[PDB]
C-alpha cells in the first residue's frame, strides 16, 4: 500500500512506486526551502514485513538538484508505513547541505514528517 | 580513482560499495559489521552531480532496507551526509535506523548515529 | 508564567517545570512509556529574552533516568521551542542515550519528537 | 565519576563541568564556532550509579545561548555517555534548536556529534 501520492504536514507532495524488488522510485516536491518543482527520489522498503501488527520499514533520498534549482543539499527520510483505513508513513529526516570543512558542524538539519494520502488543511 | 565511486569502510568496519551514476544516482551494496544484518544488502541513493564551486562538500544520501535472502531485520537505515575530496577523502554521514514497530512501540522505533567512511581498508 | 506549569505530551507523559528568571528550568518528568518508574529530576535552560515577532523561545532539558524506584542507566535530552498564546506548545526533538559497552555504542541513541500541551 | 573537569571537543570548544553527588551537572560552555561569544551557563544530569559491566555512564546537558555578550536565540542539548579508560571520553550527539516562526520551524533544528577528551589543543 506504499505506491501512490502522499502529502506531509507542510503540504509537500511525495509520489512513489514500490517495486517487487524492494525499490522505491518517484518524485518529491517540497512546499518549503530552496527547492523548485519536482526532484528525483530513490529508496528502499521491506518487501516482506512482520505480520504481528508492526509497520513496514522504509527510507528514501532526494538530492536537491534538478533543471530548475540546485540547492547543493540532500534529504533522507527514514520511517515506517502504517497500514489501515487511514494509512500513514511516519518519518524522521536528515537534510545535509554541502559545506566547507569549517562549517561542517552546521551541515545537517533534523526533523520529522508524517505523510497521508489526504492533503492537510 | 578519485570520486564517490568505489569501496568505502566506516569506523565499525562495515563495507559500502557504491557507483555514482551520471544523473545523480547512487547504487551498490552495503555489508554491516554490526547488528542483525548478514551479508550484502542492496542500496540506492542520490548525490549532487554538480556541487558548489566554493570548496564545499558534495551532498548525498542513501538507503538500505535490511532484507536480503540471508536475514530480514524488518528495518531500514538512511545515511545523509557529504563527500569531501582530496588526499584524505571522506564520506561523513549521520544516519537514522528505523525498525518496524507496533504503534505502542513507535516512540522507540528510531536509532540515530554517525558514520565516517574512508577508502582505506581497516587494519 | 508561560513556560512554568504542568505539560503533557502525545504519549501522556507528565512534564512539571519552573522557568526561573535566571534562565533555569527545574522540575520533574514522569514517562508514560519505557523503563522509567515514577518522577525523575529534570534540569534545563531557556532563552530568558526571546524574540517577539512570532518566533518561539528556545529551550532544552535533561533527565537522567535514575531515581529511588528504577535506574534505567539512560538519559534523555529534549531540545525545542516554546510557543506562547492560549494554545501554548513546547515542540521538541529528543535524544535518549543508554549506557552501553563500546561494542554496542552504535546502537546507544534513540531519536524522536515530543509535542507538549499545557 | 571522572566527569568533573575541563573537556575539549573536536571543534576546540571548552566544556567546564562539575558532576555533583545528586546527579547534577553544572558549569560553563564556550563554543569555538557559531553565533556564540564567550562563556554560557550549562546544566544537566548524569547517572550517578552506572552499571559495572563495562557500560558507559549516560548523561546530558543544555546550553541556552544567552549571556551578557550575545543572545543567539537558540539552545543546544548534548546527550551521550562518559567512557572510562586510558584516555577518558564523553561521546555525544546534539540537537541545536533556534527560535523560529511556525512557518520556519521545519528548519529550526541542527543535529551533530561531539566527542570530548581532556586533551588541550596545541
Ligand atoms: O532547501 C533545501 O536545501 C532543499 C529543500 C528541503 C526541503 C525539506 S526536506 C525535509 C522537509 N520536508 C519537506 O517536505 N520539506 C523540507
Ligand atoms: O540491526 C539491524 O536492524 C540492521 C543492521 C543495522 C546496522 C547499522 S546501520 C547504521 C550503523 N552503521 C553501520 O555500518 N552499521 C550500523
Ligand atoms: O526507557 C528508558 O530508558 C527511560 C524512559 C525513556 C522515556 C522516553 S524519553 C523520550 C520519550 N518521551 C517520553 O515521554 N518518553 C520517552
Ligand atoms: O550558533 C548558535 O546558535 C549558538 C552556538 C552553537 C554552537 C554549536 S553547539 C553544537 C556544536 N558543538 C560546539 O561546540 N559548538 C557547536
Numbering used by the authors:
A (entry chain E): 16 to 135, 301
B (entry chain F): 14 to 136
C (entry chain B): 15 to 132
D (entry chain A): 15 to 136
Article, verbatim:
Streptavidin is a 66-kDa, homotetrameric biotin-binding protein first isolated from the bacterium Streptomyces avidinii. The streptavidin–biotin complex has an equilibrium dissociation constant of 4 × 10–14 M, one of the strongest non-covalent interactions found in nature. The loop connecting β-strands three and four, which is often called “loop 3–4” (residues 45–52), also makes important contributions to biotin binding. When biotin is absent, this loop appears to be highly flexible and dynamically disordered, but it closes upon ligand binding, further burying biotin in the pocket.
